[PDB]
Amino acid sequence: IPEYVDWRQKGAVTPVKNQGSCGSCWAFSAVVTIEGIIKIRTGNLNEYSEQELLDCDRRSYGCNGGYPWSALQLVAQYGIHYRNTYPYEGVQRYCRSREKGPYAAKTDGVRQVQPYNEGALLYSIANQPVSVVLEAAGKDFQLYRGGIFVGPCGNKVDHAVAAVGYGPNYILIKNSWGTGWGENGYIRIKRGTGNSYGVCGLYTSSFYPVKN
Numbered sequence: 371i372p373e374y375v376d377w378r379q380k381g382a383v384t385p386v387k388n389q390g391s392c393g394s395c396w397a398f399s400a401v402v403t404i405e406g407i408i409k410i411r412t413g414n415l416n417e418y419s420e421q422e423l424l425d426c427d428r429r430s431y432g433c434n435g436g437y438p439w440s441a442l443q444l445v446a447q448y449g450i451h452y453r454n455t456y457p458y459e460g461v462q463r464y465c466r467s468r469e470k471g472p473y474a475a476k477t478d479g480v481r482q483v484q485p486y487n488e489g490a491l492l493y494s495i496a497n498q499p500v501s502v503v504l505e506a507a508g509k510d511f512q513l514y515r516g517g518i519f520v521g522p523c524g525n526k527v528d529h530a531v532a533a534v535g536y537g538p539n540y541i542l543i544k545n546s547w548g549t550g551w552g553e554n555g556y557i558r559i560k561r562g563t564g565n566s567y568g569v570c571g572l573y574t575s576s577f578y579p580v581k582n
């Protein structure tokens with residue numbers, strides 16, 4: 371795999387979103403990976419609905435948090451609508467998938483990256499955007515403005531994001547806190563430290579969609 375990957379440069383990443391106060395990061399994270407794999411497999415970049423996963427993933431807890439793997443399983447089992455059809459409201463409401471016509475996109479499964487393994491994660495990122503988790507509660511992460519982030523931070527993961535690239539010393543992350551946070555919405559997180567958890571626990575739990 372190459373020394374640099376940046377899925378934005380291949381036109382496979384949509385604009386940075388803001389989840390607001392709702393604990394919907396798990397849905398935003400999943401949608402980044404759907405938008406990516408559909409561009410990779412079909413040539414077309416579209417925005418898909420975080421709100422639909424928020425409302426409809428019965429294994430998750432709405433704005434009280436959720437699971438990227440369950441959200442991804444939902445898209446593989448049923449499908450997902452365009453963001454325009456099912457726009458983001460920042461609050462969990464009833465599942466309205468049935469009321470909104472046929473699904474826009476569908477995937478074929480979900481796989482997990484072997485946890486606590488930097489190289490396995492890089493291998494997956496070289497193939498597509500990956501849903502990853504990290505510890506975001508620390509004030510160093512909250513106040514991040516730019517550069518390759520080394521912490522301080524622990525490994526108590528609490529925030530789902532999307533890895534959309536990497537370089538020799540970092541993994542490139544699309545956050546869902548708006549374009550004014552970090553590097554226009556992104557953070558580069560230090561890698562290669564020898565810590566099996568990853569910086570801020572970045573290697574704890576990583577999933578990606580499969581599409582034939």
Ligand SMILES: *[C@@H](C(=O)O)[C@H](O)C(=O)N[C@@H](CC(C)C)C(=O)NCCCCNC(N)=[NH2+]
Nearest residue numbers: 393394395396431434435436503527528529
């Ligand atoms: C993340 C966010 O929006 O910043 C959000 O709090 C979240 O989804 N957290 C997850 C953990 C990450 C995926 C690591 C979470 O806490 N999931 C478990 C669901 C919440 C616990 N149970 C109940 N009933 N609320």
